[PDB]
Design a protein around this ligand. Sequence first.
Ligand SMILES: [Cl-]
Ligand SMILES: [Cl-]
Ligand SMILES: [Cl-]
Length: 163
Amino acid sequence: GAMAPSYRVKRMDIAKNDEECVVNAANPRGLPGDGVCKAVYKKWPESFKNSATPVGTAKTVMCGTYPVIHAVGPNFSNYTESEGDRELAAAYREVAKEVTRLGVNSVAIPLLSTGVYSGGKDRLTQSLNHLFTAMDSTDADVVIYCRDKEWEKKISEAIQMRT
Ligand SMILES: [Cl-]
Ligand SMILES: [Cl-]
Ligand SMILES: [Cl-]
């Protein structure tokens, strides 16, 4: 574990992370996809060997010895708000199980279901609170990656307000 487990947020490509493993915002079919998924495919394409997994689950595939945790958030275009919320919470619980199983001291994580799977809604708070619910009992340093300047500020505020 980290000596003083922390949350941090950085605004940059998660393909450039400084953590011991990465969470991919994956699709269920293990396809290169778009956004974070496409960045992860470009950086760690070896990790997409048998990475297909259902919605609400995470499946880790090693790129060399570097773990890529493929976490499949729901596409809110396809799910009802209720069932999408349930699957999004479940995907993060499976991320916390994998981070724990791997014994890493740090993990790079994007906000699941916030991009093209958002169904055109702002899900920063929904997705971040499910991240916290799952990761709070872990002792890994968690570094959240985002691209939007206003999201960085809002994530940073949510982190700092619980310290
Ligand atoms: Cl960047
Ligand atoms: Cl997404
Ligand atoms: Cl963002």
